[PDB]
Design a protein around this ligand. Structure first.
Ligand SMILES: CC(C)CCC[C@@H](C)[C@H]1CC[C@H]2[C@@H]3CC=C4C[C@@H](OC(=O)CCC(=O)O)CC[C@]4(C)[C@H]3CC[C@]12C
Ligand SMILES: CC(C)CCC[C@@H](C)[C@H]1CC[C@H]2[C@@H]3CC=C4C[C@@H](OC(=O)CCC(=O)O)CC[C@]4(C)[C@H]3CC[C@]12C
Ligand SMILES: CC(C)CCC[C@@H](C)[C@H]1CC[C@H]2[C@@H]3CC=C4C[C@@H](OC(=O)CCC(=O)O)CC[C@]4(C)[C@H]3CC[C@]12C
Ligand SMILES: CC(C)CCC[C@@H](C)[C@H]1CC[C@H]2[C@@H]3CC=C4C[C@@H](OC(=O)CCC(=O)O)CC[C@]4(C)[C@H]3CC[C@]12C
Ligand SMILES: CC(C)CCC[C@@H](C)[C@H]1CC[C@H]2[C@@H]3CC=C4C[C@@H](OC(=O)CCC(=O)O)CC[C@]4(C)[C@H]3CC[C@]12C
Ligand SMILES: CC(C)CCC[C@@H](C)[C@H]1CC[C@H]2[C@@H]3CC=C4C[C@@H](OC(=O)CCC(=O)O)CC[C@]4(C)[C@H]3CC[C@]12C
Ligand SMILES: CC(C)CCC[C@@H](C)[C@H]1CC[C@H]2[C@@H]3CC=C4C[C@@H](OC(=O)CCC(=O)O)CC[C@]4(C)[C@H]3CC[C@]12C
Ligand SMILES: CC(C)CCC[C@@H](C)[C@H]1CC[C@H]2[C@@H]3CC=C4C[C@@H](OC(=O)CCC(=O)O)CC[C@]4(C)[C@H]3CC[C@]12C
Ligand SMILES: CC(C)CCC[C@@H](C)[C@H]1CC[C@H]2[C@@H]3CC=C4C[C@@H](OC(=O)CCC(=O)O)CC[C@]4(C)[C@H]3CC[C@]12C
Lengths: 1060, 96, 71
């Protein structure tokens, strides 16, 4: 409704002057067909012709919006229509295509080159194409180019055409108000009126009142182009949008339009094409034969006059006037870029167009760089802005670096860095908070994270819209997303002190770390992959990025956001994990010991952590299952012991015989010092042996086996009123194990006790241990009383011995073959459960039927439910109860009489036994068999992942086994009281030179991986085939041109031989 | 649906036999036991809704044909051994 | 649905149809077999055209030799 109330229209209410034809008025319409003010006396009214046009026919179906406007309307209102009602963003480039209104045909290769150029130019910059609207001549060529574009590309080219309203065929067909109107692409050759072009996007059909006459649109199009060019571009460096003027063929008027474009403030560059003919060819012949602009000698002046008089069929004075207008154009010869087919005329439309825009702007190179940044054309920037000898202002390159960063232009970062711009000198604290607070580029979820951590920190709520996200808030986001005891460098007291005292000290020592974190947080994947290559600590950066992407994917799924976001962040997490795995593979291929040093050393920039800890916290199964991590974990397992030959027996012999300890080959003092917080050799050997995790595990295993044997003795032998010595040892083991599990609860990661309890009950073995310890205390309390509670305590003791015998599988989980077997059993338990369900259905059907037939007169008693399940369950395991299948009855051998329907019981027994024993057992065999391989590979990888958890658990465990652990517990309470009265991991703590060689080894591995990946991509079959096919294409077109030039040279040689 | 119709007709026959006196009441009880076999089997319709139990049930239905062919070959071998054992160990038998 | 929702549903269907069709065309044109066939055929036309170019080059060399002999 706004279009009718804002735009106006004019209709022909005149005195009907006949002039030549009595029906034809001044407006050209029929004399009875009626219903500027000079001789038309036109009246103004709201519009009645606007909406959408459905182009019926002409191949592809395409919808184009349209509106009928007055020719005298102000262009700001029209612009506002395009920006608001048609939802068109402000273009980064305006193209004005002018040419002859008569239809013409060009060369096929010229038409193909011009069409491909116009399509690519309007695609890559997102331009607006301004045509004549109707389907005549150059606009017909533009429509054919857009037809080829619709036939082979994803683009929607905004190709707004402006035509007069009076000349378009079927004017009554386009009458409506926000109504879709079908249109016919057929044009009657008898009618002088022409149809609109089918492949246009918008129409600004302008009515001056007259019909069948031009000139109603040129002024309006010119003021709209000017008004667009006064609008500032989004770079906000101080320039408007650039305007180019493409000229194909043309008539006598297009020289005047070229003059009007050149003699304008600001000037507009003009690109012409050669080979079409008419005004373009005379412009080209003027441009090549021009010398110093307007300095044209007499002979080519007369040649230009005779070509104007011959091609344009003009008189002598008309040709002289056109030559005067030509010279007035040629005064500004620098603005005209002439494209020539073949030769060295840029071999392309678009290089000519874009460099014409570049030197028509004629500004400083920062303005040119901001233009190329807005157009997303790194190729033209590299080829012409960054040419040799280009002067650059101080500080402009860093401003363009910032602008390329905030707009997500990765290749522009690459070009600016290659040019020389360095992150160390560019990155400041202020620039990075500006980067975190940008609004350009793709969408992101970071405002939700900062809102959640602000709600959690100060329980406010929703942030203000004009909120500047500080780096402290970003640090809190890293703390929450990483989880655990991670402490980001922003939240430390040093950076908060620097932030309070300031809002090379403000420069970042590792700027690529901050750029990596910024890129992953604001969901810019290509930027993060670019920043991963550059800088040190690549594997740490990859694992941190993997954890960040996984945890933001989880948080986005938790806040009920778009699921496509969560899928993309999971894909980014899997990509960063795959990078980390390939880096580990490269480091393992180069040097094993440097790879372990890379995996183990403390990362001061990542909360004092370890690459192994970061991989475990990211739950990266493939990282720990890699051979290098497995051998590092094996080295961590043996502690300070070389050994590594017939393991198990030597450490058992050392535990049982203490003088066997000193006959062992111990490791060096500084061979691989994995530490948590950074007679004498005999004592050092004793202390180094007894703190090894393998030694602690075997001591724990021997104590558990001895306790299990004592429990077996106290349940098999009878017990007296008071417990024996063996039962006291078993009770002591249970109590000290419970105290040890309580100490594991208290020495955990969270602060609030319910969170520690929840994170400790997240393991199934811990909750079953707690249930067993409570069951033992209940049974012991019942046993210490008199009868009949002592037998109940004995029964609870038997249930507990079932549990501890099952818990031997925890000890069995350490072996390389038994552990995967155990979790494989755990995987097959689900298929067992489904089998148990179907067995349950069939079993109770047979049980209910058998019991209800064979026992008709029964009272309500719970023995019926027992008889339901009793014999049919044992029928599965080879006991069919053959004496009770069909006993002889109703005869004398006096037997009791036959129950009615007792013969049914063997028949349904036969059906039940067949179904159960032959169907469901064999089906469960099939389910166990066909899911074995996936389950087996998964259990192997999961066991190799949980080796780390086992090693850390046994390293953090006390030296003494549980039955003697009360002495070590008293040692820690005494030490804790002494520390009160007066960092969980195994890092290496290298020096600075070792850090230097580790970093250089990491850079060598990064370059090796990257351009080995490039070598594999370049030597693959698909890439070779594609490359060969494309070079065959260029070869065939060039050889066709060579054949044409060879024919021309043969004709010239024949003429020269005929002459001489 | 056809098994449901057969079961409902069987229940009405058994209930009609049960509402009389002896010996038809025991026959109605026997028909009730055959029907409880059927409804216990028809729990698999409710089980067909779960994402894992449903495919399991129709998978069982697919393997029933291979069971039938096994039952045929077992039937041939089983009656060969049964006829041979009974006809050797019991030479003097009346038609029964 | 209403009529406007029918309109956006129909336009979404047309977008999906064009996406499927000329993505299928892109997959057909970037496949290895089609590339190999295209390269072989353009090598055929290239070889016959280069044989014609060699014949015309021999004729042009003979004409240039005759013109040099004349002058
Ligand atoms: C390190 C692992 C692999 C083995 C450690 C366990 C054994 C050294 C323990 C566990 C069970 C113990 C037995 C449990 C019960 C008894 C009965 C006990 O006899 C009595 O209690 C009645 C007579 C008396 O009081 O001496 C004599 C010791 C003995 C054989 C114990 C001997 C030592 C055993 C074999
Ligand atoms: C640390 C635990 C988990 C296993 C370690 C094994 C041994 C240190 C234990 C297990 C069985 C124990 C034996 C179990 C029973 C007895 C009988 C016991 O006889 C008496 O006490 C008789 C006199 C009395 O009735 O008081 C003397 C200790 C002895 C040999 C124990 C000595 C220590 C043994 C060998
Ligand atoms: C004396 C009678 C009552 C026999 C006892 C039978 C059950 C109480 C036991 C026998 C085998 C046990 C299972 C053997 C192996 C495993 C894998 C293990 O689980 C894991 O290692 C976790 C990983 C995973 O589940 O895959 C411990 C649970 C489970 C299912 C056990 C659960 C308890 C089970 C079913
Ligand atoms: C479908 C399959 C995989 C599982 C279904 C079978 C079980 C649920 C059944 C089969 C045997 C049943 C047991 C058979 C006998 C008894 C003894 C009964 O105790 C008595 O009768 C008291 C002592 C007596 O009177 O002799 C209590 C139920 C119980 C444990 C039954 C509990 C249910 C059991 C374990
Ligand atoms: C108490 C005694 C007599 C045991 C009863 C034995 C049979 C009457 C039952 C036991 C298992 C049943 C089968 C379990 C599973 C299926 C699949 C289900 O069929 C479908 O879901 C249709 C699709 C398909 O057939 O694959 C119902 C029929 C069938 C063959 C059942 C037919 C009846 C069976 C053979
Ligand atoms: C789909 C499947 C899982 C259904 C399984 C149903 C049966 C196994 C249950 C359901 C109702 C139960 C009955 C509910 C009530 C009683 C009465 C009860 O009587 C007494 O305890 C005596 C009363 C007294 O003297 O206090 C004996 C068990 C019994 C027959 C139960 C036996 C087992 C039944 C038949
Ligand atoms: C669902 C699957 C995965 C697990 C199987 C669960 C049930 C089939 C079991 C678990 C608990 C069992 C019940 C536990 C205790 C009893 C009491 C028991 O009573 C007696 O034996 C009374 C003594 C007598 O008179 O003999 C009869 C069986 C019954 C109902 C059991 C029937 C079978 C039940 C329901
Ligand atoms: C090849 C396999 C898969 C199937 C072949 C086996 C069945 C067809 C057989 C095996 C057991 C047979 C049953 C064994 C015993 C009897 C009891 C019989 O009734 C009596 O003898 C009346 C009571 C009495 O005299 O004790 C009726 C036949 C029947 C149901 C038989 C019917 C045929 C059955 C089910
Ligand atoms: C290829 C396979 C499937 C062939 C299987 C053949 C046998 C299982 C059948 C076929 C003929 C049957 C016999 C046909 C006739 C009789 C007489 C019949 O006698 C009576 O009923 C008594 C007569 C009266 O007093 O009324 C007892 C069963 C019997 C032996 C049948 C027993 C079972 C037989 C041997």
């Amino acid at each position: 409704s706004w279009i009718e109330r804002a735009f106006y229209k004019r209709e022909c209410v005149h005195i009907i002057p006949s002039t030549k034809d009595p029906h034809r008025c001044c407006c050209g319409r029929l004399i009875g067909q009626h219903v500027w003010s000079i001789s038309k006396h036109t009246q103004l009214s709201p519009t009645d012709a606007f909406g959408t046009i459905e182009f019926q026919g002409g191949g592809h179906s395409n919808k184009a919006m349209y509106v009928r406007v007055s020719f005298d309307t102000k262009p700001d209102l029209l612009l506002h229509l395009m920006t608001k009602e048609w939802q068109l963003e402000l273009p980064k480039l305006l193209i004005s295509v002018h040419g002859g209104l008569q239809n013409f045909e060009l060369q096929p290769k010229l038409k193909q080159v011009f069409g491909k150029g116009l399509i690519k130019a309007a695609m890559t910059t997102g331009a607006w194409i301004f045509t004549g609207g109707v389907n005549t001549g150059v606009i017909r060529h533009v429509g054919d180019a857009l037809k080829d574009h619709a036939s082979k590309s994803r683009g929607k080219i905004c190709t707004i055409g402006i035509a007069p309203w009076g000349i378009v065929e079927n004017q009554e067909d386009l009458i409506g108000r926000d109504v879709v109107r079908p249109y016919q692409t057929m044009s009657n050759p008898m009618s002088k009126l022409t149809v609109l072009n089918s492949m246009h996007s918008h129409f600004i059909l302008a009515d001056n009142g007259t019909t069948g006459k031009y000139g109603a649109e040129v002024k309006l199009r010119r003021q709209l182009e000017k008004h667009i060019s006064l609008q500032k571009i989004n770079t906000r460096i101080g320039q408007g949008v650039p305007v180019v003027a493409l000229i194909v063929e043309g008539g006598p008027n297009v020289i005047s339009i070229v003059l009007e474009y050149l003699r304008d403030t600001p000037p507009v560059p003009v690109v012409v094409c050669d080979g079409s003919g008419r005004a373009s060819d005379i412009l080209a012949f003027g441009h090549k034969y021009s010398e110093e602009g307007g300095l044209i000698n007499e002979s080519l002046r007369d040649q230009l006059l005779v070509t104007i008089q011959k091609t344009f069929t003009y008189t002598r004075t008309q040709a002289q006037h056109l030559f005067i207008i030509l010279m007035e154009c040629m005064k500004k010869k620098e603005l005209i870029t002439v494209f020539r087919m073949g030769s060295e005329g840029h071999q392309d439309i678009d290089l000519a167009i874009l460099t014409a825009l570049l030197k028509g702007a004629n500004a400083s190179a920062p303005d040119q760089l901001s233009l190329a940044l807005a157009w997303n054309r790194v190729d033209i920037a590299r080829s012409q802005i960054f040419i040799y000898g280009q002067q650059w202002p101080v500080g402009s390159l860093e401003q363009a670096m910032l602008d390329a960063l905030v707009l997500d232009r990765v290749d522009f970062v690459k070009l600016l860095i290659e040019n020389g711009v360095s992150m160390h000198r560019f990155l400041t604290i202020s620039r990075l908070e500006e980067l975190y607070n940008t609004r350009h580029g793709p969408s992101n979820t970071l405002y939700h994270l900062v809102r959640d951590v602000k709600k959690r920190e100060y329980p406010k709520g929703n942030l203000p819209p004009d909120y500047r996200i500080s780096l402290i808030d970003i640090g809190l986001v890293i703390e929450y997303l990483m989880g655990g005891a991670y402490r980001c460098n922003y939240t430390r007291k040093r950076f908060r002190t620097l932030y309070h005292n300031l809002f090379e000290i403000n420069h970042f020592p590792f700027p690529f770390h901050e750029l990596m974190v910024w890129a992953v947080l604001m969901k810019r994947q290509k930027m993060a992959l670019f920043f991963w290559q550059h800088g040190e600590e690549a594997m740490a950066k990859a694992l941190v990025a993997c954890k960040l992407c996984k945890a933001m994917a989880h948080e986005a799924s938790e806040n009920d956001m778009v699921d496509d976001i969560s899928q993309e962040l999971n894909h980014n997490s899997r990509d960063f994990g795959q990078l980390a795995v390939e880096l580990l593979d490269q480091s393992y291929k180069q040097d094993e010991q440097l790879a372990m040093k890379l995996l183990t050393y403390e990362l001061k920039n990542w909360s004092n952590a370890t690459c192994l800890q970061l991989a475990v916290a990211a739950k990266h199964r493939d990282f720990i299952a890699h051979t290098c991590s497995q051998m590092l974990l094996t080295d961590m397992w043996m502690g300070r012991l070389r050994m590594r030959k017939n393991s198990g027996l030597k450490v058992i012999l050392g535990i049982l015989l203490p003088p066997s300890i000193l006959s062992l080959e111990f490791k060096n003092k500084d061979d691989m010092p994995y530490m948590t917080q950074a007679l004498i050799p005999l004592g050092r050997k004793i202390y180094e042996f007894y703190n090894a995790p393998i030694v602690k595990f075997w001591f724990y295993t021997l104590a558990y086996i001895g306790y299990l044997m004592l429990f077996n003795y106290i349940v098999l032998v009878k017990m007296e009123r008071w417990p024996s010595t063996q039962e006291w040892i078993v009770i002591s083991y249970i109590f000290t194990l419970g105290i040890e599990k309580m100490r594991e609860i208290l020495m955990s990661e969270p602060g609030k006790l319910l969170q520690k309890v929840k994170v400790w009950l997240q393991e199934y073995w811990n909750v079953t241990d707690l249930i067993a310890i409570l069951l033992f205390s209940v049974g012991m309390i019942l046993r210490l009383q008199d009868q009949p509670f002592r037998s109940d305590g004995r029964v609870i003791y038997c249930v507990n011995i079932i549990y501890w015998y099952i818990r031997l599988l925890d000890i069995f989980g350490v072996n390389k073959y038994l552990g995967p077997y155990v979790m494989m059993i755990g995987k097959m338990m689900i298929d067992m459960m489904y089998f148990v369900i179907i067995m349950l259905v069939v079993l109770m059907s047979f049980g209910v039927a058998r019991q209800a037939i064979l026992f008709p007169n029964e009272e309500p008693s719970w023995k019926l439910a027992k008889n339901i399940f009793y014999m049919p369950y044992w029928m599965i395991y080879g006991e069919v109860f053959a004496d009770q299948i069909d006993p002889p009855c109703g005869q004398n051998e006096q037997l009791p009489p036959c129950k009615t329907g007792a013969w049914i019981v063997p028949a349904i027994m036969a059906c039940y036994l067949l179904v159960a024993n032959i169907l469901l057992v064999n089906l469960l065999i099939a389910v166990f068999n066909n899911t074995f391989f996936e389950v087996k590979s998964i259990s192997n990888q999961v066991w190799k992942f949980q080796r780390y958890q086992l090693i850390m658990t046994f390293h953090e465990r006390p030296v003494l086994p549980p039955p003697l652990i009360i002495f070590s517990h008293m040692t820690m309470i005494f030490q804790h009281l002494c520390c009160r009265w007066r960092d969980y991991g195994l890092k290496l703590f290298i020096t600075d030179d070792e850090l230097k060689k580790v970093h250089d080894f990491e850079e060598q591995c990064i370059e090796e991986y990257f351009r080995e990946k490039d070598d594999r991509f370049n030597s693959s079959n698909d890439e070779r085939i594609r490359v060969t096919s494309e070079r065959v294409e260029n070869m065939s077109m060039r050889l066709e041109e060579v054949n044409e030039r060879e024919h021309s040279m043969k004709a010239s040689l024949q003429t020269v031989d005929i002459r001489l």
